[PDB]
Amino acid sequence: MHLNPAEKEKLQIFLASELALKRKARGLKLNYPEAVAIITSFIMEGARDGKTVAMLMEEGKHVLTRDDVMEGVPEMIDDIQAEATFPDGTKLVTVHNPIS
Amino acid sequence: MHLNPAEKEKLQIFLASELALKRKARGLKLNYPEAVAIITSFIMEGARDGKTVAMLMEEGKHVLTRDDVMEGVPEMIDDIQAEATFPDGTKLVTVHNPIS
Amino acid sequence: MHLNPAEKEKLQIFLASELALKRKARGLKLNYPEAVAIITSFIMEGARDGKTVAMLMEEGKHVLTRDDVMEGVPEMIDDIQAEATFPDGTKLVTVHNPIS
Amino acid sequence: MKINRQQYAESYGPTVGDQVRLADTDLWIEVEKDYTTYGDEANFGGGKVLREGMGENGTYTRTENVLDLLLTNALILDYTGIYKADIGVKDGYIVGIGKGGNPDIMDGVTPNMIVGTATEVIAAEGKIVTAGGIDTHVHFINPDQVDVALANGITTLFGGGTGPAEGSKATTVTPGPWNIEKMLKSTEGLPINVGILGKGHGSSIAPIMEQIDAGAAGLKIHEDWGATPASIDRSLTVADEADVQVAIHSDTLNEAGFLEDTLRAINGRVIHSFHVEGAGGGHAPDIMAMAGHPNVLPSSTNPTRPFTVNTIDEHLDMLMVCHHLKQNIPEDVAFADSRIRPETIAAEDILHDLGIISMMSTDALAMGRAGEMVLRTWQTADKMKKQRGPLAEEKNGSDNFRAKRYVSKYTINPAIAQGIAHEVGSIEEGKFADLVLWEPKFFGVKADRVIKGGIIAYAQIGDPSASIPTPQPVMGRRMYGTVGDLIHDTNITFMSKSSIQQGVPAKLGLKRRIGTVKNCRNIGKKDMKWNDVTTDIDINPETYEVKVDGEVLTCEPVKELPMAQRYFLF
Amino acid sequence: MKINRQQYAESYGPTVGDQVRLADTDLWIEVEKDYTTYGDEANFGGGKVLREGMGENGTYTRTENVLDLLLTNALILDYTGIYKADIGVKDGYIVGIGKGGNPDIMDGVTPNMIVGTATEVIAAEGKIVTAGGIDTHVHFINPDQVDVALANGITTLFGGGTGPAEGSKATTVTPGPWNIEKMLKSTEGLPINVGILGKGHGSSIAPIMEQIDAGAAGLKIHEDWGATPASIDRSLTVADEADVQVAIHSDTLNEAGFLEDTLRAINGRVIHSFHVEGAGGGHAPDIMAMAGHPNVLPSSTNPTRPFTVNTIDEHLDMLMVCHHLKQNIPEDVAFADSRIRPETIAAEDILHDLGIISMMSTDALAMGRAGEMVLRTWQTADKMKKQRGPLAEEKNGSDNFRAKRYVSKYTINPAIAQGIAHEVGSIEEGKFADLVLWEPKFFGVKADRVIKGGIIAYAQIGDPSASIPTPQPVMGRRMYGTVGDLIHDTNITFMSKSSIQQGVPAKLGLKRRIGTVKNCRNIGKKDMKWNDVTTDIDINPETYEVKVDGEVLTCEPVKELPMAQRYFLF
Amino acid sequence: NYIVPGEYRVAEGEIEINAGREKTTIRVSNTGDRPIQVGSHIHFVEVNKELLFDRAEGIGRRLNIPSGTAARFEPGEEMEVELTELGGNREVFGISDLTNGSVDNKELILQRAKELGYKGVE
Ligand code: NI
Ligand code: NI
Ligand code: NI
Ligand code: NI
């Protein structure tokens, strides 16, 4: 596979997102790291899909809403940042105030 | 996400449980680490769900039965212990003789 | 669980394969590490199922075809090798030219 | 020109009279004073103030009043106060708390806090800064426990052990000169301050004392090695000669005596009573009465902190594993059960709130959680505010008195108890620069950056391949202070005066900073900051009811805590 | 008062006459003798025996017959016996095997096994304790291979390599003075004992000998560097002068000679024949005949161990990668195919069972598995019991003779072969305290705790954040023996006498314990414990059939092994 | 046929502890209000002062119970226990500092016990 350090690390984010999605599916309000993991994995999968940075900057605001998360979580998350390999190489996506 | 060392480690348990559950679903009798992973992940998800320690001490005895596992596995597992964040903080669950 | 170093590492391969399978399921042509992960995890799960080394040497050539992967990926993968615990202990499976 | 307060606080952190919520608790801390000069605040970045000829002085060499490091705009939470200041570090020590910058052009610059060519900057605006936690009940069982501790803001580990040997899995003991030497050498690779306790057991002086001369920083008396009148007596005789502290885990079984017999053996000498409530060990049921005495420095371990609905149910199996007991031996189970009591655990919450138990500690990996000393301190304070109300001593609707009482339990008080407060345990000028930055939303839960001897040792930081350090995954990671030989200069091995005089560091090739243990024998409960209360504690032998000043101390367990499921992935 | 046997064994481990199953095999070991005094068994914990004035002596200083460490109630499995004893360790060495405690009050205490103030305790009741494995066929290819080895109970790595360079990926060789110096320096950070082999190739003495003087502990003759009569001869001349061992991988191709030519070049001198069956290399098809000769110390590598239904199919591609061969070169494939033979692999099982092959080894990362030497030894023994029956020498229905024969293959025999058995390779008084604890259910599969020089270096242990060390995830982890400078005192670098005399350790700044290689040239097959059989081995050049004493040695491959899918996650 | 990995097959018979040593049965009362538990290897005369028994009969002896076990006395509880003789050099040091030498010095041990208020000395 020739995994580099970031590829190994970022597997963790996907895993944490899968965990969090299972928790959401059984009806739990998500906590801070769960919410961050879901939105982060969404961004990295979006890059893999070939979306643009600009698309993901706006989609990232609609992945989770306040009723999906515990009290105070929306206000704890000022932004989420992730880098992934787009068709045009690695780029940074910053999603400001992802959960209103 | 602000993952601490235990949060990183415990992702592995969830992953191993998912692996083991796929193996069970395709009809395999589970081995020692598979059985331990499934019961352990069950406990940690139970804590996340807001069950009590006492509930999990008894539920943990009914997750897998001897027909789910290979010969000798029930006798290899004297107990399974796991710590997770309950609504009232980290607590230890010990399940004695989880597979009869 | 008593995980040894290889058991910990090889969890990663399963995880990467799950990631890659999700990407395939949503219609993406797979890349080099994705293709390797899928075929590798297939081999290790096959060993767990109790297949022989010889069976997996030939099945490994039929897991992914060239239309499943990006241009050039078939030619990038000369072989895939994996070791797993068969019913008769650890063995090495080598799949030559897994994607024609 | 005037700045409204919301905008001021957003830019520079809070100032006088502003309050900040601690994590998701209902505890509020209020800024008591601010050392700045409004308009001359230090800050660093593109077009900011700390630039040559401006807020950075371009004239002075490093020796001329210039800092190695300035933490700008810190909200300090410490036994000494809750207040706003810049913190100046030099030669690995805190040298100034006040106002940093350039006397060329700024008013009110503390004279030894010049930002010069030699000065690094850490922005602490919007952060709470505390001293590093001092954990004095550490079992050295698994090296992976160090990062666990760092992640919750602990910077000093005092205790004992040789790894996962049964003696160490039960007791904070590194026994004898050889094991002590081996663990001093191991310590060279641990990125945290360390002091090692010898076995406080024997009936002759020499076998105990030779541990001190070998490099131990103290002793542990533990019932699993025989917490007899003789072992107690000899250990305290050694400690009084050597000027080191003794920790005690007393005779739960009451085999050779009851509590009063242990106190008679102590004979008014100074001692640190571990897990004073007693689930973690001690004369059943009444050990917690130790915490009323003037010669006792009392600490709790953390799994009883605070009293919750699940607390009791986890303890029996925990205890049986730690102390190598067998479920099929009825007296083993009876011994274990005798240590677990809701009555004393409930009272322990209140005794903390009253300043009668002076310290917190972990009991890492031997009935305690390496990364939850700080966490559970604040959960306890929060529960007590909910159940008891604001303390009478509070003003302005703030919880500053309670916050000072509680922060002292895991910073200054353990340092004083151990004879190391000249080096560590508080944010004061002249002390080692072990500092923890916290985002208020994560306060007491997950540390932002842990500074050890003036260099960052541990941080919550993201993708090392990214364009900036903030992208995911953000996790706790060891920083440059832990790498190469820098691990030697950023950490202290605390040792007895005798071992230092006898040249043990040179003999073993120790390269770490060497700290001297001293002034351990001339202190008492009166010296525990904000937690100095002596009183008669009565524990009913039939009902386990705890009384102080004729009043039963009890409270309810809670079903939920803050600093819990909002934060943790597992 | 009497205790029934089931309850006795549950509390203290088994005693005389009791049997224990090895993992999930059908091998049973029986306790032959027990050094205890019934009623005075040592044990540690709350209210237990090893307490001051009781089972722990409170009088004696560390020098006065007191131990640094007592392993209580060990079931020892060793070439010297299968028996029950306490094991006493001091200064990193095994100093007593017998009965530990306090002569004040206990009967039958071994005089130098006093539990005192200085003594740590490891509870070995219910554990099997063996010597650390001695792997003498290690390719140093990937540092991650060390933990793999530790996890299966290996504590000494002898071999060569500089990392994943093709020379090292094929051969156990660290070539020349500079590469040897570099790898001796690397070794300072490897938490395992090490000895390094130079290149056993040349036609002049000086280029070979200068490797020995540089710090090599032996030589490797390998066909990939030319296993010619000259290289064989010069290497053995060097070895005879230097008192180090030579390992040989002979000329598979029969290019410069057949087996008889290699034996003539050896000329009766001592040599260690690697992978003597020959899949791993050597004169095709008859190399295994080496194992009949009195001057040959024969080892197997592990992928042929034991003969299973999948064994052949994995080998061709494995061999081609290791030896840098090309699938499109017909003679490369012919060479590879010539080394792989069910006839010799089947006979190799039997030759092990008969004591004709004396040693096991890995061939780590170059046609062998770093963490499966111990594993595959016991799988082989189990297969042989199933197919051949209990050995004639057995009694009481136990498999003690077979167990001693097989444990010797990876402990004492490789140590003797290498000239290091004065330090390592068995549980005997005066040897280095490299000890492996095993739960019987995991015996030979996953080690519980690996002790190196008297300190735990590796352990299967759980959550470092937990209240106790047993909660999940339980995995193999490096312990305090590997941290800081303690890695120097808990491990041995084995070196030639000449390099030691010439001050190589000081020249390179080596801080590890330095072990001397000696008494390598004055031994033979007769010195291989429980595996000392010499005989004429005939290998049919047409059919590859192996004969000993006129009988064809053959057996069937098995479809399943114990110590396999019950245990492993992958 | 069923395989329990690592299982024991213990031999027949029973293990006699403290074989060949004199045994003595005595009555002991916990006169205190908190429980007292006594381990197998503590010099019996040196136990908690509030245990009432004939102290002389505890000299040079310990409980005749399996190594690592204990006898538990609840508050007010009187029970009969069996003692065995100490072995080895028959010396005791430390613990309650009643002996610090040979257990043969009965008079000295009892004098110290009486002076310090250990219940049950003549
Ligand atoms: Ni304790
Ligand atoms: Ni403790
Ligand atoms: Ni070879
Ligand atoms: Ni090799």
Any CB–CB contact under 8 A between B8 and chain A? yes
- E strands present in B36-88: 79-86
Phi/psi of residue E123, nearest 5 degrees: -85, 115
Residue E298 alpha carbon to ligand 4 centre in Å: 14
Note whether E324 and E459 are same-domain residues: no
**CB within 8 A of E470, min separation 6: which ones?**
B81, D321, E461, E462
Prior bond of D562 cis (ω within 30°): no
Prior bond of E285 cis (ω within 30°): yes
Q: Hey, what are D220's tokens?
A: 């542990």
Tell me how far CA of residue D4 lies from CA of D11, D30, D75, D167, in angstroms.
11, 18, 19, 60
Structural domain that includes position A15? 2-100
Query: Could you tell me whether strands A89-96 and A79-86 are parallel, antiparallel, or unpaired per DSSP bridges?
Result: antiparallel
- Residue E488 assigned as binding residue: no
- Residue D422 assigned as binding residue: no
Phi/psi of residue E199, nearest 5 degrees: -80, 115
Q: What is the DSSP string of C19-53?
A: HHHHHHHTTPPB-HHHHHHHHHHHHHHHHHHT--H
Residue ranges of domains in chain F, CATH in brackets: 1-122 (2.10.150.10)
Q: In chain C, how long is the greatest CA-to-CA distance?
A: 42
- Residue E526 assigned as binding residue: no
Residue E221 alpha carbon to ligand 4 centre in Å: 11
Cα-based angle E345, E349, E352 (whole degrees, multiple of 5): 125
Torsion-angle region of residue E196: left (phi > 0), alpha (psi -120 to 50) or beta? Answer: beta
Q: Hey, what are E484's tokens?
A: 């800081």
Note whether D116 and D149 are same-domain residues: no
State how many domains chain A has: 1
Note whether D284 and D190 are same-domain residues: yes
Query: Could you tell me whether strands D19-21 and D28-30 are parallel, antiparallel, or unpaired per DSSP bridges?
Result: antiparallel
Structural domain that includes position E292? 132-425+484-570
Query: Could you tell me whether strands E546-548 and E551-552 are parallel, antiparallel, or unpaired per DSSP bridges?
Result: antiparallel
Residue among E242, E248, E184 nearest E213 (CA): E242
* CA E164 from centre of chain: 23
F11 closest CB neighbour out of E2, E18, E106: E18
Amino acid letter, D178: W
C5 closest CB neighbour out of E148, E313, E567: E148
Any CB–CB contact under 8 A between F11 and chain B? no
* Catalytic position from the list D201, D315, D323, D352: D323
Residue E222 alpha carbon to ligand 4 centre in Å: 9
* Contact between A19 and B11 (Cβ < 8 Å): yes
Note whether E569 and E469 are same-domain residues: no
Q: Which ligand has the shortest distance to the CA of E339?
A: 3
Contacts of D334 in chain F (CB under 8 A): 35, 37, 72
In whole angstroms, give the CA distance from residue E503 to residue F53: 69
E48 closest CB neighbour out of F6, F68, F95: F68
Any CB–CB contact under 8 A between F7 and chain B? yes
Note whether D141 and D272 are same-domain residues: yes
Query: Could you tell me whether strands E69-78 and F51-52 are parallel, antiparallel, or unpaired per DSSP bridges?
Result: unpaired
Cβ of E215: how many Cβ atoms within 10 Å? 30
Q: Determination method here?
A: X-ray
In whole angstroms, give the CA distance from residue D123 to residue D49: 12
List chains adjacent to chain C, taking adjacency as at least 3 C-beta pairs closer than 8 Å: A, B, E
Instruction: Assign residue E43 the CATH number of its domain.
Output: 2.30.40.10
Any CB–CB contact under 8 A between B11 and chain D? yes
Nearest CA in chain E to C43: E570
Coil, helix or strand at residue D530: coil
**CB within 8 A of D379, min separation 6: which ones?**
B89, D25, D305, D306, D561, D562, D563, D564
**Residue written as token pair 């007491």:** D444
Q: Hey, what are E327's tokens?
A: 């699938």
* Cβ–Cβ gap D147/B90 under 8 Å: no
The 3-class SS string of A47-86 reads HHHCCCHHHHHHHHHHCCCHHHECCCHHHHCCEEEEEEEE
The distance of A54 to chain D (nearest Cα, Å) reads 17
A11 closest CB neighbour out of C12, C26, C36: C12
- According to DSSP, residue D325 is labeled -
**Residue written as token pair 């530790």:** E150
**Residue written as token pair 């655990």:** D345
The distance of B39 to chain C (nearest Cα, Å) reads 11
Contacts of E568 in chain B (CB under 8 A): 31, 33
E475 closest CB neighbour out of C1, C86, C89: C1
Note whether E516 and E473 are same-domain residues: no
Residue among E411, E413, E410, E420 nearest E519 (CA): E420
Coil, helix or strand at residue E332: helix
In whole angstroms, give the CA distance from residue D214 to residue E120: 16
D323 part of the active site: yes
Tell me how far CA of residue B96 lies from CA of B56, D317, D474, in angstroms.
11, 10, 37
Cβ of E158: how many Cβ atoms within 10 Å? 29
List chains adjacent to chain D, taking adjacency as at least 3 C-beta pairs closer than 8 Å: A, B, E, F
Note whether D97 and D236 are same-domain residues: no
- Residue D404 assigned as binding residue: no
In whole angstroms, give the CA distance from residue E235 to residue E209: 8
* Catalytic position from the list E323, E352, E422, E488: E323
Residue among D355, D388, D359 nearest D376 (CA): D359
**Which of B71, B77, B97, B99 should we substitute to test contact with F (largest number of F Cβ atoms within 10 Å)?**
B71
**Which of B7, B48, B86 should we substitute to test contact with A (largest number of A Cβ atoms within 10 Å)?**
B48
Q: Which ligand has the shortest distance to the CA of E137?
A: 4
* Contact between D515 and D423 (Cβ < 8 Å): yes
Note whether E111 and E149 are same-domain residues: no
* Cβ–Cβ gap A92/D566 under 8 Å: no
* Contact between D318 and E41 (Cβ < 8 Å): no
List chains adjacent to chain B, taking adjacency as at least 3 C-beta pairs closer than 8 Å: A, C, D, E, F
CA atoms in the 13 A half-sphere facing the CB of D312: 15
Bridge partners for E449 per DSSP? E437, E459
In whole angstroms, give the CA distance from residue D480 to residue D462: 15
Q: Hey, what are D331's tokens?
A: 């007296």
* Contact between E180 and E510 (Cβ < 8 Å): no
Cα-based angle E99, D325, E457 (whole degrees, multiple of 5): 65
* Cβ–Cβ gap D144/B88 under 8 Å: no
Note whether E435 and E325 are same-domain residues: no
B6 closest CB neighbour out of E441, E463, E468: E463
* Contact between C31 and E502 (Cβ < 8 Å): no
Residue among E187, E488, E191, E506 nearest D509 (CA): E488
Coil, helix or strand at residue B59: helix
**CB within 8 A of E484, min separation 6: which ones?**
D185, D186, D187, D188, D189, D190
Tell me how far CA of residue D196 lies from CA of D45, D139, D453, F91, F120, in angstroms.
43, 10, 20, 32, 42
Any CB–CB contact under 8 A between B81 and chain C? no
E151 closest CB neighbour out of C5, C48, C93: C5
Q: Hey, what are F58's tokens?
A: 């505890």
Tell me how far CA of residue E492 lies from CA of D539, E187, E316, in angstroms.
56, 10, 36
Note whether D153 and D171 are same-domain residues: yes
Prior bond of D177 cis (ω within 30°): no
Which of the listed residues D416, D449, D483 is the one where a domain comes to its end? D483
- Residue E352 assigned as binding residue: no
Q: Hey, what are E206's tokens?
A: 């000086």
In whole angstroms, give the CA distance from residue D156 to residue D316: 29
Bridge partners for E537 per DSSP? E548
The 3-class SS string of E113-157 reads CECCCCCEEEECCCCEEEECEEEEEEECCCCCHHHHHHHCCEEEE
Report, in angstroms and rounded to the nearest whole number, the Rg of chain E calculated over CA atoms: 24
Contacts of F97 in chain D (CB under 8 A): 203, 229-230, 233
State how many domains chain E has: 2
Any CB–CB contact under 8 A between B16 and chain C? yes
**CB within 8 A of C17, min separation 6: which ones?**
C37, C38, C40, C41, C42
Phi/psi of residue F43, nearest 5 degrees: -50, 115
- According to DSSP, residue C3 is labeled B
Note whether D187 and D124 are same-domain residues: no
* CA F67 from centre of chain: 11
Coil, helix or strand at residue D111: coil
- According to DSSP, residue B35 is labeled H
Contacts of F30 in chain D (CB under 8 A): none
Residues across chain B: 100
Amino acid letter, D393: E
CB pairs under 8 A between D and E: 220
Chains E and F touch (3+ CB pairs under 8 A): yes
The distance of A88 to chain B (nearest Cα, Å) reads 27
In a 10 Å sphere around its CB, with 0-12 CB exposed, 13-18 middle and 19+ buried, how is residue D48 labelled?
Answer: middle
Note whether E398 and E312 are same-domain residues: yes
Amino acid letter, E512: R
In whole angstroms, give the CA distance from residue D483 to residue D300: 34
Instruction: Assign residue C87 the CATH number of its domain.
Output: 3.30.280.10
CA atoms in the 13 A half-sphere facing the CB of E84: 26
The distance of E46 to chain D (nearest Cα, Å) reads 4
Nearest CA in chain B to C10: B16
Residue D333 alpha carbon to ligand 2 centre in Å: 19
Cβ of C31: how many Cβ atoms within 10 Å? 17
* Cβ–Cβ gap C89/E472 under 8 Å: no
* Contact between E65 and E112 (Cβ < 8 Å): yes
In whole angstroms, give the CA distance from residue D245 to residue D419: 7
**CB within 8 A of E185, min separation 6: which ones?**
E508, E509, E510
Interface of D with E in 231-290 (CB under 8 A): 231, 252-253, 255
* Contact between B43 and B95 (Cβ < 8 Å): yes
Prior bond of B5 cis (ω within 30°): no
Torsion-angle region of residue B43: left (phi > 0), alpha (psi -120 to 50) or beta? Answer: alpha
Residue D24 alpha carbon to ligand 1 centre in Å: 32
- According to DSSP, residue D34 is labeled B
Nearest CA in chain E to B41: E472
Residue among D401, D361, D353, D405 nearest D380 (CA): D353
* Contact between E365 and E320 (Cβ < 8 Å): no
Residue among D117, D133, D137, D107 nearest D41 (CA): D107
**CB within 8 A of D549, min separation 6: which ones?**
D535
The distance of A59 to chain D (nearest Cα, Å) reads 17
D546-568: buried (b, 16+ CB within 10 Å) or exposed (e) per residue? bebeeeebebebbeebbbbbbbb
Query: Could you tell me whether strands E69-78 and E81-90 are parallel, antiparallel, or unpaired per DSSP bridges?
Result: antiparallel
Cα-based angle D304, D310, D311 (whole degrees, multiple of 5): 15
* Cβ–Cβ gap A33/D568 under 8 Å: yes
